[PDB]
């Protein structure tokens, strides 16, 4: 039941190494630059 | 019978007479519904559901809006399939 599929690395490695960092950097860059009301 | 000729032909006739023959008569009878008055006079959501919120304006000179097209087109389709269906019954085996 626990064993993940044999294709899990193919999806998660690019997802956590290329996709989430891109969204995380965009989120952080916008946040720090945001001006107070 | 060819369905394309019969169905299109009947629809054209019913659209033609509706636009050119009975449009004046139909509009006059629609005003007989004005003599009675509006259904409701309220400002609640359920009262709004009984009013002509959207008025279907048309650029046609005679005022033959889409609702009229649907009405007269439906009669043509209904008559067209009656003609086709009845003619189909000829030369039917065991039917």
């Amino acid at each position: 039941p626990f064993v993940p599929p044999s294709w899990a690395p193919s999806v998660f490695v690019p997802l956590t190494g290329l996709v989430l960092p891109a969204i995380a950097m965009a989120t952080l860059f916008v946040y720090i630059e945001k001006e107070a009301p | 019978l060819d369905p394309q000729i019969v169905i299109s032909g009947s629809t054209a006739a019913f659209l033609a007479i509706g636009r050119f023959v009975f449009l004046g008569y139909q509009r006059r009878e629609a005003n007989f519904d004005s003599t009675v008055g509006p259904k409701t006079t309220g400002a609640t959501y359920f009262d709004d559901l009984q009013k002509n919120s959207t008025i279907f304006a048309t650029n046609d000179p005679a005022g033959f809006n889409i609702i009229d097209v649907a009405g007269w087109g439906a009669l043509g389709h209904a008559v067209g399939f009656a003609v086709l269906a009845i003619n189909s019954l000829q030369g039917a085996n065991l039917s």
Binding site: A22, F29, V30, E33, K34 | -
Partner: protein
Amino acid sequence: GMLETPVTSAPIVATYLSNLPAYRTGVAPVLRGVEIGLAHGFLLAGPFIKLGPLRNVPETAEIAGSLSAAGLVLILALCLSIYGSAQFQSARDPLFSADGWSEFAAGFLVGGEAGVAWAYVCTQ
């Protein structure tokens, strides 16, 4: 004032820059985005195809290189978008505004990907 120099102040140089999409005012920001995106997108495919990891494969080299050029254009489009968000939060040219830049970034994505696709069609 500033140190005058032919490079900084010359007639021929000034006219050339004034005709570039970036400096050509009077054009909608979206259209300028497409014009700029197409030029960069078309060039971006070159280096990936010739020097990529799959460069020596006969037919896969063209596809892999162009597909990577399309990816880089997508990343650049994100950079343009977030730059507008940070820079314009509150003047003569419509481009340098929150509304203008957002259109500009969208045009760059459309133009850039079209340029990458157009470059591929040239090869095959």
